[PDB]
Nucleic acid binder design. Structure first.
Ligand SMILES: [K+]
Ligand SMILES: [K+]
Ligand SMILES: [K+]
Ligand SMILES: [K+]
Ligand SMILES: [K+]
Ligand SMILES: [K+]
Ligand SMILES: [K+]
Ligand SMILES: [Mg+2]
Ligand SMILES: [Mg+2]
Ligand SMILES: [Mg+2]
Ligand SMILES: [Mg+2]
Ligand SMILES: [Mg+2]
Ligand SMILES: [Mg+2]
Ligand SMILES: [Mg+2]
Ligand SMILES: [Mg+2]
Ligand SMILES: [Mg+2]
Ligand SMILES: [Mg+2]
Ligand SMILES: [Mg+2]
Ligand SMILES: [Mg+2]
Ligand SMILES: [Mg+2]
Ligand SMILES: [Mg+2]
Ligand SMILES: [Mg+2]
Ligand SMILES: [Mg+2]
Ligand SMILES: [Mg+2]
Ligand SMILES: [Mg+2]
Ligand SMILES: [Mg+2]
Ligand SMILES: [Mg+2]
Ligand SMILES: [Mg+2]
Ligand SMILES: [Mg+2]
Ligand SMILES: [Mg+2]
Ligand SMILES: [Mg+2]
Ligand SMILES: [Mg+2]
Ligand SMILES: [Mg+2]
Ligand SMILES: [Mg+2]
Ligand SMILES: [Mg+2]
Ligand SMILES: [Mg+2]
Ligand SMILES: [Mg+2]
Ligand SMILES: [Mg+2]
Ligand SMILES: [Mg+2]
Ligand SMILES: [Mg+2]
Ligand SMILES: [Mg+2]
Ligand SMILES: [Mg+2]
Ligand SMILES: [Mg+2]
Ligand SMILES: [Mg+2]
Ligand SMILES: [Mg+2]
Ligand SMILES: [Mg+2]
Ligand SMILES: [Mg+2]
Ligand SMILES: [Mg+2]
Ligand code: NA
Ligand code: NA
Ligand code: NA
Ligand code: NA
Ligand code: NA
Ligand code: NA
Ligand code: NA
Ligand code: NA
Ligand code: NA
Lengths: 262, 187, 72
RNA sequence: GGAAGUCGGCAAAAUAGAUGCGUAAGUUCGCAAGAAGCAUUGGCUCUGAGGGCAAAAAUUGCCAACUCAGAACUGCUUACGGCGGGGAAUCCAACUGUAUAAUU
RNA sequence: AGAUACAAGAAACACGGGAGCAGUUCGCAUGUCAUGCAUGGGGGCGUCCGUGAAUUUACUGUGACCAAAAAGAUGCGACCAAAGCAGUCUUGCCGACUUGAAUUACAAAGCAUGGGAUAACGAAGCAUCAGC
RNA sequence: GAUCUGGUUGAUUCUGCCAGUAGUCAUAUGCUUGUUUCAAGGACUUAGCCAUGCAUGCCUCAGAAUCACUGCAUUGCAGGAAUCUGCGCAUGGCUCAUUACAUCAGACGUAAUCUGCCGCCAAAAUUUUGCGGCGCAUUACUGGAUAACUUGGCGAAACGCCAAGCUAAUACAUGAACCAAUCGGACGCUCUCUUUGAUGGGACGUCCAGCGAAUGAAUGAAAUUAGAACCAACGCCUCCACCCGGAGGCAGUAACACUCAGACGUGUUGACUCAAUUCAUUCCGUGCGAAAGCCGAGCUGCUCGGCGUCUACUGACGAACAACUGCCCUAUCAGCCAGUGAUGGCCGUGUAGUGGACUGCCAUGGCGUUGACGGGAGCGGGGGAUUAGGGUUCGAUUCCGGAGAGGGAGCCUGAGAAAUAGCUACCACUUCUACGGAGGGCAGCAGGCGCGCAAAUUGCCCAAUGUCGAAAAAAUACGAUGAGGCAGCGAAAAGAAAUAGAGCCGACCGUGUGGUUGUUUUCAAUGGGGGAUACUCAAACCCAUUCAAUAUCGAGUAACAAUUGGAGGACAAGUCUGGUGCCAGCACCCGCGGUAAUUCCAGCUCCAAAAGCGUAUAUUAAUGCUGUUGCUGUUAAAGGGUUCGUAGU
């Protein structure tokens, strides 16, 4: 149906100025939802600054030169999202798309060995034609023979070069999760308890590394390891530790003032 | 044309609704098939999203299931005898879902002989088939009404498919209290 | 939840919901009501004045969208 | 063509049974009212509703009479007799009735 | 340890297809035609079944779920300002792991505290009372 | 800024209105206008009518060139007009007529459904071809058509048309055995073996056994009690060394008559008649190619990469339904709904799917003073104006949702339309004609007529932001785009800011050697303007820099000249001087004008605010004159003649 997207209607986290054009590229159907993605044109032009226009980005994209899951993508409207690895072999850049502690997208550099793994969350399990069990993933993958103890809410570690599952981490008390949506996105905490409420949304109660408690809907949590030292991916700078706004302003003012002394 | 919307209906308060906007293709209806009984004739209809529906016009045969024995046979429909909507449908010989019909009973008689050895060619059988017949007949029991109908040459059945939507006339034989309920009406 | 209002139709009853509406300008409340028609199974036998719990289902008639789940 | 005829629509034409829907001003609230007006109507083959009397009784059996309501098919040359034309106003007498056998 | 009170977030039964191996607490055996390369008091977990004479709303505290633009707000001498989300300098084949914080948005709805003021129920007191 | 003032009396204290006052991205009109930045702009009335021009197309190394096309070679290499094929045109843009159980907003659903392009994936059905007449194999070298073209042409024309003759495919139509697996259902005049004919065991052969769809059957768990004894046949363990036949008992023990001694005894949800498995009978075009496809590399005979396409399944982008709460005025609108569906029930039909959505039968229900039914104004929201607080009022208009394309109805193709720069007909308007006929739809951009108090160029460009697409850019070799941007017009509105600065002398001022007015003067500065080695820009323009870097014009009456309203009060500013004489006129209100006008018409002075300032209409505050916070009711307007009394509080 719809084929356009106005700038005022575009997601706030793309950081598009309202005085530069009427339109924004709208994402196509694909791995990630429209409101929770980051298109390839935005990354190449606005984040990495490798291109000055959309014409220059089209020169880079319609050549390969950019892989998003180990496969080159020639579409500037490809929706890239959480836990994706963007590689540019010509310049030797490898990034992973995570969430900042303020809920914004963040590109973190990864090593060559770490760039071949990925974490995916199960969302559904069903049975195929040949009595084949398949698990559906938040990214949109369909894995045809998961471990027989794979459940709907947990996560499994994937190798994108050799398409095989590395291991499976189930969801339970005392595990480390990341919040992936709503007023708490980007925070990291331990699971304390989960309230059920059948027929409605479950509520997950979590505890921060500094001891602060917060709650969110159980569909917004993403298991990343059994403990903070066993997380198999690199985390952003702040490590998901939200701090007070008053204190944060004070530190920002103290800095850039000592810088002016130097 | 025909529509299936609630815009032309009165409100529960009895008031009349003032209609703005025109008729949309998403709410169309179509003219009924009115399937009769005769040599097979169908008419394709292109439905929403591609796909084809089959309109039944003058069907005369189908697959009828013997539920107790968990089998089915291909039989020819002979006539329509009852309809819970109106006698007009019975008079005009219209095949719809839940109609009560009769079938020729020849395929079901043949299956019974080859499965149980009872004839309502049997004597020319292998010894191991004869032994198998004795086992099956050891703890199997047929009922009064079914055995009488199979001897007579016809038995009653009800249509289970929707002939106007799929172009098929399939059904199940009547048994149990259902057979008694419809036998008393057909008197 | 609601209160049984009438049980005249076949396998159907009318329940009434009473609630208070807040008018901001006067900082006061006013009383309102709403009537809903639901389907009742023969396993229940409600009478006017009773209290029932209903749950949403697919459209069953022109005006029926709820089914009786429990009579208290 | 349609009252131009004539003192004057005199005379003729015209409406018409039954069923469904609908019906103004005025009024003494009873009426006005069949106000005005629109539609259907044949033939043939079927379907439903409306009852009595017996029995060791939401059952079974036997039986009478002619109304009403529907459906399919088919047809018209609008086709016996019998059967209100309607409306808007003015004058007089309240009304039913009587009354110059042989011009009122 | 039992009784007195209180706890249907409770008591009393049961489920290995129940706890990533049947949770926490006071080399020898089985199998060997095997990839058998296997296997070796009391209290919390999950899932069902009987037990109430069952307790609920309003209100209030704290959090969830809530497009942008616009409105309130932090920071930055676009020469100032209406603006904008930029920009700054150790003179850079660069750096600041640069920034772009954080708010309000009726009424209804949803989670878990509190029980003072209220409101919805029930009862009209021999239409009752069974003691372990 | 939590603010008030003038008018009723001979004077006083009140009630109450009229008038004054401030704002409005709020419209219009009048006078005036030097510089610069940022901006709304035919909505109001007529969803009135339209001349002309332009607004949606797309080719890569990778579907199809014998142009009787072009450039080089000399039986080739390139570019390729035109046509066929594939995808898109259901988006964007415009407008606000309709519209109150509708639309919309916040919260929820679809277990009631459809879903092209995109992501991750899946695939073991099928007797074909050649040769010799059923046999044998180096078993995939398959078929007719039709456009562009040429040969006749018809017609006044028409985004009109006919016939014949050529030739392509990733168009259309047919078609593939072995290689090549496991898995289980019916049978037999067929063999072989063990017992006394066996639901006996093994072979042999003969019909079915792929995804999807239809009907019927089974599975889709269990979770309320502990020990014994007999008989049927099933599995094991002991004898009497084994065999023969003929004895006696439960140690252990997931299942399963071999080649597989663990090759699912366990789907999912809050919940399922759902997912999936097995068995029986079916599918006739209304389904299922390895496109019998196209390019690159390397070594007739092979190897490796990049693309393209049919079917099945579920994520994303969506579509369509349903409705928990909420939304202006009106009772001089009190009852509404049922022949012909009104409220519910039963079996069906129709739909992608639920449903009185619809056919038949049955019952008498459903809604309403907590305002139904009827009428009036009106697209809904995010939001704007006015800000002590509470409130009042506006929202055609940039973002989201809905609806429409003169009116109104119907429909084809498509994954999606009841589509309008798609088709069909009628109504109202309307264009060309050779009079036979053929056309039209600006509420897209620019422009015109009319209407009105009321609103801009028939401009430049795809450089930026995006959309479509066979598509990166470049090279023998340049997609479209009035969507969008840029400039022109533009005192709607908003920001910054010139119209002079510093002194000497002389004569004067009013306080009492300082404060300042005037005319002859001097002496620096600066723009408005003129230009450029140039900067900007798609190009041009505006802004910004500069008036030598060897080498760049300019202020003195700085004529480079500020306006619009006022001077009795409200309300800042004259008891000045002429003219008129209840006339002319002023005056929002009180009032002025008949010979000495503080008010008219003028001159001179003075006041307000200023590149702006008056006037009209609407609206907010003034207004505690709509009062919930927060009014009044003895005499100013206002307590029912008295009791009873229901809904309500
Ligand atoms: K009359
Ligand atoms: K009489
Ligand atoms: K139904
Ligand atoms: K299509
Ligand atoms: K462009
Ligand atoms: K004078
Ligand atoms: K008052
Ligand atoms: Mg005459
Ligand atoms: Mg005459
Ligand atoms: Mg006469
Ligand atoms: Mg009357
Ligand atoms: Mg009549
Ligand atoms: Mg008389
Ligand atoms: Mg008389
Ligand atoms: Mg007489
Ligand atoms: Mg803002
Ligand atoms: Mg006096
Ligand atoms: Mg080419
Ligand atoms: Mg085409
Ligand atoms: Mg649109
Ligand atoms: Mg919403
Ligand atoms: Mg095969
Ligand atoms: Mg097994
Ligand atoms: Mg309107
Ligand atoms: Mg609006
Ligand atoms: Mg309007
Ligand atoms: Mg505007
Ligand atoms: Mg406009
Ligand atoms: Mg439309
Ligand atoms: Mg028009
Ligand atoms: Mg249309
Ligand atoms: Mg047009
Ligand atoms: Mg125009
Ligand atoms: Mg190119
Ligand atoms: Mg080109
Ligand atoms: Mg435009
Ligand atoms: Mg200005
Ligand atoms: Mg001047
Ligand atoms: Mg200049
Ligand atoms: Mg004067
Ligand atoms: Mg004055
Ligand atoms: Mg004064
Ligand atoms: Mg005025
Ligand atoms: Mg004078
Ligand atoms: Mg006011
Ligand atoms: Mg006030
Ligand atoms: Mg008075
Ligand atoms: Mg009184
Ligand atoms: Na007075
Ligand atoms: Na200038
Ligand atoms: Na200038
Ligand atoms: Na495809
Ligand atoms: Na409005
Ligand atoms: Na819209
Ligand atoms: Na038209
Ligand atoms: Na104007
Ligand atoms: Na007021």
């Amino acid at each position: 149906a719809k084929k356009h997207l106005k700038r005022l209607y575009a997601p706030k986290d793309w950081m598009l100025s309202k005085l530069t054009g009427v339109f924004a590229p709208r994402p196509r159907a694909g791995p990630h939802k429209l409101r929770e993605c980051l298109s390839l044109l935005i990354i190449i032009r606005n984040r990495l600054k490798y291109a000055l226009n959309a014409l220059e980005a089209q020169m880079i994209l319609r050549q390969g030169l950019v892989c998003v899951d180990g496969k080159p993508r020639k579409d500037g409207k490809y929706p890239a999202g959480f836990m994706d690895v963007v590689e540019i072999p010509k310049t030797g850049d490898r990034f992973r798309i995570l969430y900042d502690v303020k809920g914004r997208f963040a590109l973190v550099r990864v090593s060559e060995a770490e760039s071949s793994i990925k974490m995916m969350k199960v969302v559904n399990v069903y049975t195929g034609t040949g009595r084949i069990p398949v698990a559906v993933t938040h990214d949109g993958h369909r894995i045809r023979y998961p471990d027989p103890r794979t459940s709907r809410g947990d996560t499994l570690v994937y190798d994108v070069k050799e398409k095989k599952v590395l291991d499976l981490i189930k969801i339970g008390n005392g595990k480390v999760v990341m919040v992936t949506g709503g007023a708490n996105r980007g925070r990291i905490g331990e699971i304390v308890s989960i309230e059920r409420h059948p027929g409605a949304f479950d509520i997950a109660r979590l505890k921060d590394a500094s001891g602060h408690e917060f709650a969110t809907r159980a569909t917004n949590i993403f298991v990343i390891g059994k403990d903070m030292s066993s997380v198999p991916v690199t985390l952003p700078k702040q490590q998901g530790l939200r701090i007070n706004v008053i204190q944060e302003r004070e530190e920002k003012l103290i800095a850039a003032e000592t810088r002016r002394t130097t | 044309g025909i529509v299936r919307s609630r815009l032309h209906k009165r409100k529960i308060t009895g008031g009349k609704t003032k209609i703005h906007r025109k008729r949309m293709k998403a709410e169309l209806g179509r003219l009924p098939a009115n399937t009769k009984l005769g040599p097979r004739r169908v008419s394709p209809v292109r439905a929403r999203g591609g796909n084809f529906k089959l309109r039944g016009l003058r069907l005369d045969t189908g697959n009828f299931a013997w539920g107790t024995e968990a089998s089915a046979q291909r039989a020819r429909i002979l006539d329509v005898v009852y309809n819970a909507t109106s006698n007009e449908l019975v008079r005009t010989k219209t095949l719809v879902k839940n109609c009560i019909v009769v079938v020729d009973a020849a395929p079901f008689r043949l299956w019974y002989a080859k499965h149980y050895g009872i004839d309502l060619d049997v004597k020319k059988a292998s010894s191991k088939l004869k032994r198998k017949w004795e086992y099956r007949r050891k703890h199997h029991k047929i009922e009064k009404a079914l055995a009488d109908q199979l001897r007579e040459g016809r038995l009653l059945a009800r249509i289970t498919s929707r002939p106007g939507q799929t172009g098929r006339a399939d059904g199940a034989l009547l048994e149990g209290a259902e057979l008694q309920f419809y036998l008393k009406k057909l008197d | 939840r609601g209160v049984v209002h009438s049980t005249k139709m076949r396998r159907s009853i009318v329940i009434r919901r009473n609630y208070l509406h807040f008018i901001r300008k006067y900082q006061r409340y006013q009383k309102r009501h709403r009537n809903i028609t639901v389907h009742c199974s023969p396993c229940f036998d409600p009478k006017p004045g009773d209290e029932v719990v209903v749950g949403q289902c697919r459209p069953l008639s022109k005006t029926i969208r709820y089914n009786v789940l429990q009579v208290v």
